[PDB]
Design a protein around this ligand. Sequence first.
Ligand code: SF4
Ligand SMILES: [Zn+2]
Ligand SMILES: [Zn+2]
Lengths: 131, 98, 37, 752
Amino acid sequence: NKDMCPICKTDRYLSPDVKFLVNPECYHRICESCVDRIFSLGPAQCPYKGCDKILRKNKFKTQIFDDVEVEKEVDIRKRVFNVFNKTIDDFNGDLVEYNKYLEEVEDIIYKLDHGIDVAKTEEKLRTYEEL
Amino acid sequence: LRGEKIMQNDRGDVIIDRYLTLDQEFDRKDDDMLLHPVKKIIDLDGNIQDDPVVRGNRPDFTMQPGVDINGNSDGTVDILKGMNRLSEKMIMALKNEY
Amino acid sequence: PRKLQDLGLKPASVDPATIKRQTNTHMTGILKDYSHR
Amino acid sequence: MKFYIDDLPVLFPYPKIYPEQYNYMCDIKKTLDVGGNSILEMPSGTGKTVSLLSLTIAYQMHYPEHRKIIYCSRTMSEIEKALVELENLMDYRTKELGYQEDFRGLGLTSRKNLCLHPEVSKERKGTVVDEKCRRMTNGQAKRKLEEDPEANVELCEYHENLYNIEVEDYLPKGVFSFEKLLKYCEEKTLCPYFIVRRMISLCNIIIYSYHYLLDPKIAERVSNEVSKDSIVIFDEAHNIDNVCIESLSLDLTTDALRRATRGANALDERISEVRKVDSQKLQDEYEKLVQGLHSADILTDQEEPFVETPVLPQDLLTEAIPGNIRRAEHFVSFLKRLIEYLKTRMKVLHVISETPKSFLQHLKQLTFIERKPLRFCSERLSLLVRTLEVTEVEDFTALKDIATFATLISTYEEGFLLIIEPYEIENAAVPNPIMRFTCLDASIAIKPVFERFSSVIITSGTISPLDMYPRMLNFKTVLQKSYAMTLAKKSFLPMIITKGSDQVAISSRFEIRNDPSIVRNYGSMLVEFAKITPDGMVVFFPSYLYMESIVSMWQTMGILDEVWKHKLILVETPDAQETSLALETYRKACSNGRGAILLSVARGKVSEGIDFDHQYGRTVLMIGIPFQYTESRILKARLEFMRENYRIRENDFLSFDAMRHAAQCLGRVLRGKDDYGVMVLADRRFSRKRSQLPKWIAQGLSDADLNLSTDMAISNTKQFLRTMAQPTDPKDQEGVSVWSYEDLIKHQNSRK
Ligand code: SF4
Ligand SMILES: [Zn+2]
Ligand SMILES: [Zn+2]
């Protein structure tokens, strides 16, 4: 797992040109070679033991942080900050309101990361983004 | 014992070399034989321990003992301690029971 | 060796094209040859 | 003696006085009465500390203001010397005034230097000592013991015994040196460290190192108790900039970050464990955080924050927590992703230097951490750890470094730079990435000191040139002058050697350190001088690495065998305890006539407070100019900042920095005027640095000695040593170099 593809086990030592990729849907490492073959002609199920989440090739990206757990939080933070975005001037300098607003956003992000209330919170995200 | 760097390229006597590890035990025993509390006037340990939380920029390699490519000590520091130990033992020998 | 170098793997050999194969005679019998020092 | 100044009577602890000392005292009195800062450069061969204490102590006892005195030295050993001199001066006053006046004087240092606990004083690291003492003194053990005596937690009898007596009765009136302080406290089972820190507000004169005044981590607690109008003295402040810069500097390695993730994971696990069983503590802490309280309002005076404030007290935000890191879990996640960003920035392949603003902008881009929450990282962590019942903090020790970095980078933006290097050691098989946060401006750390205190005296034996220090440190002086010793007969012979006996130029340039001719030429100089030097010889090298290489070369050649026949060889080592034993052996060897030679580093531990008065030093051999490593990213950045801001040329500062260290070592040989020694500067580059040396040293350097050979140097040294062994004529120094009471009055009459 150190430097070999979980599927084809193409180690970098024998294939230094190998390049790894990850998918936000399940955050699973996979080399470029496997991605093209399984998803070139259309969507397919993740080829992992225990994972049945479908994914598309276009969604693959390069991992930034070496820790998968931190990657999930940052991407969720980016998704939330695309809807829940405000500044101190938004509350006319009211620090107390701004601090409470920041904590609420942090609370939402925490719930999304650990799936406390996925159904209820997801609806709240959809409700707010419209207005 | 002459304070000269030992070279792995050349080997001397098989019989005598057996005592090399024993000397490492004597040096540690001799280090305690010389270690004792020092007057605060020339106490260099307290100068560096004056601020236990001091954290700045660590010194360059010129201010630290030399190291090899592999990162281990080159061994030149050991002879420096050996001559330092020899001088300390000579002075201590003067202050005998007599 | 060239094929491995082109694919990335370091070859543990080289092409064999690179190797470069690289008056007075009464004193006769008395004077020793002190040619060098 | 007891003479008079314009209106201030001063009691000198000796029947005699040098002309320089009286002139030194008069100038100091003028500065104190007029106010402001001043820079005084007094020779090392004349009593400086005694003069300072004599005048300042009289000043505080005579004027109605009774201003307190703050004495700042550079090392703990200097504090001991100052206290010993103070005790002698106070004893003389007590014998002439007929009574012991109300006076308290104490020195300060870390717990390691004053811990009497039989189990905690046996530690080789000061951080561990602090942790153990805090565990037994935070009060958690006392509170737990009160609730349930069956608790196995122990207490410190020394700390406990102090509660019985009042703070004003910890020590009897007088001056207590460290040697005396430990003995008195041992006989009564009391903690010297806590006694001193609780009496700072009551001491007439307080002595501590520069780290206790310039480093924000430890200065704030001590500074909060001292007075605002007290007298401040900076003794031996010729290297104060290094202390100022190192206070706001940090270095991060790959191992530090790898150890940080483990601590962060442990912290999250600990929070989960506490959440299950005891969740009221988190809510109670959260409630206060919502109110707007900080560590000062929450933490008791008995306990100390886990993370020392790494920024100056004037730069800390007074607003409530932003709210992002208000909850424990949110803060841990905030901390965790911060560590990842640091880790992913350590994979760089070439040196990158960027300002904190650029680093913050990139941080705000890759992740969504804002500047304001970053500034509170250290403050928030100290609160979370305190409420977590973290009695064992071995895992969380690494997190202190990350918090310090976060609070430093997010606070200051000017005069600071961030350096990332792919090779900590250029000669390494595997790259070792390092992230250095360096402070370029040297006046940031000292700015509060020059503003809080009105009058500050900066004195040192080799502080020259005096014009640059005001340029480097943003402050102004009412007067700045240097005294020249009025010695009747030449007592020190400063010489410069540019070539060896073979007339070959000699230099200590690092690139040519492995040269058979230079190594032999330096070795020949060492042997030849050792033959004529009677008892003691101190050898200073430009860097420790240079000493290692050159010393090893001498061993192979066989120079040392010849040196061993005349004197014992002692060498400075990186270990502090081993070096201290070497000094003890070196001093013992010089006293008994065996003769010894000490090899040290000009920028080492020996040169920063160790003295070689009379026998322990009779000749100083400066092997090369102690030039800093020019090819250093930290140094190069520092030079650029000074050039652009203070208009200081790169070459001028580098030469000034090297000379300030060479002179520093030169002044550690003369005590009084009956002391003598020969100073030789062995480098072709010293020939043009005569104008940069201290005035009292330059005046003694003749024009014929600017460039000498080894053979010529020995002849002059032998002649000088022979000349200094003759009985000095008393009449030649009755009133030209030493003043009796009658002579001093005469000088006060002619001047008036
Ligand atoms: S209270 Fe004093 S004696 Fe006790 S552990 Fe702390 S420093 Fe040591
Ligand atoms: Zn693959
Ligand atoms: Zn999957």
